[PDB]
Design a protein around this ligand. Structure first.
Ligand SMILES: *C(=O)C/C=N/[C@H](C(=O)O)C(=O)CCO
Length: 264
């Protein structure tokens, strides 16, 4: 996986941080991968929002507007973490606005609206299947999909599956050129990821990422990364802990990112 003192470094990091670490890096320069527990299941938490927004982008390829469609925001709709959907109670938001809100502020009402709109969690899972992702499963809505209970396969995927899917979505041809560019723009505009993968990368590198967090101190990040003068990287870092109310460890994701981008 590079020696494998990248593997030894990740093993150290995992053990030192006392949780379970999952990493999948794809280097598009030569198609190489660095994998650490990349076939184990992890709770996606808010990183699942990329798949929901992508499912909507894919449907917009056959429903030419779609992104302009308005969605009512109700008082009762508040799950709550929803920093954007609140400024529109008893108003509406477009699907474009809900996508942006879900992806860039991790708005949980926005996620629920995306899920509802494609047909529920099973239809988000079906979109993943149509992409050839056989591992992704979305089972619940916000906020329960973030429980992240050990042994619970609901709302999980593997780092390898999520890295390949994210590659196909942001760089490959899973989406139309227009829709791919929209997804990349949204993720590049993320506001929640400065302390996660980005914290472990040279400051000049451009990152589009989606974080996630949940029970058991689950701390996640999935990213497309353009180091300059370099071919892009896809990096998935998933991290979960054993105590139910463990605190977030976004620094572990930053360290994982440093480790696997070393030599690059
Ligand atoms: C996506 O990762 C955002 C979700 N965070 C969840 C929530 O919906 O409340 C949690 O933080 C659960 C407890 O950490």
């Amino acid at each position: 996986p590079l020696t494998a003192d990248v593997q030894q470094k990740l093993a150290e990091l995992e053990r030192q941080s006392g949780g379970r670490l999952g990493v999948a890096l794809i280097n598009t320069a030569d198609n190489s991968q660095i994998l650490y527990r990349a076939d184990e299941r992890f709770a996606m938490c808010s990183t699942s929002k990329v798949m929901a927004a992508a499912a909507v982008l894919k449907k917009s390829e056959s429903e030419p507007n779609l992104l302009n469609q308005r969605v009512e925001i109700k008082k009762s709709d508040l799950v709550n973490y929803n920093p954007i959907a609140e400024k529109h109670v008893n108003g509406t938001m477009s699907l474009a606005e809900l996508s942006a809100a879900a992806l860039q502020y991790s708005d949980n009402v926005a996620m629920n609206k995306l899920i509802a709109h494609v047909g529920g969690p099973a239809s988000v899972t079906a979109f993943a299947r149509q992409l050839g992702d056989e591992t992704f499963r979305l089972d619940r809505t916000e906020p329960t999909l973030n429980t992240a209970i050990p042994g619970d396969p609901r709302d999980t995927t593997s780092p390898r599956a999520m890295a390949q899917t994210l590659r196909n979505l942001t760089l490959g041809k899973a989406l139309g050129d227009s829709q791919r560019a929209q997804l990349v723009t949204w993720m590049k505009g993320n506001t929640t990821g400065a302390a996660s993968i980005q914290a472990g990368l040279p400051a000049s590198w451009v990152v589009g990422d989606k974080t996630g967090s949940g029970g058991y101190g689950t701390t996640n990040d999935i990213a497309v990364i353009w180091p300059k003068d370099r071919a892009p990287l896809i990096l998935v870092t998933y991290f979960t802990q054993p105590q139910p109310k463990a605190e977030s460890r976004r620094d572990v994701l930053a360290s994982a990112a440093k480790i696997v981008t070393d030599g690059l």
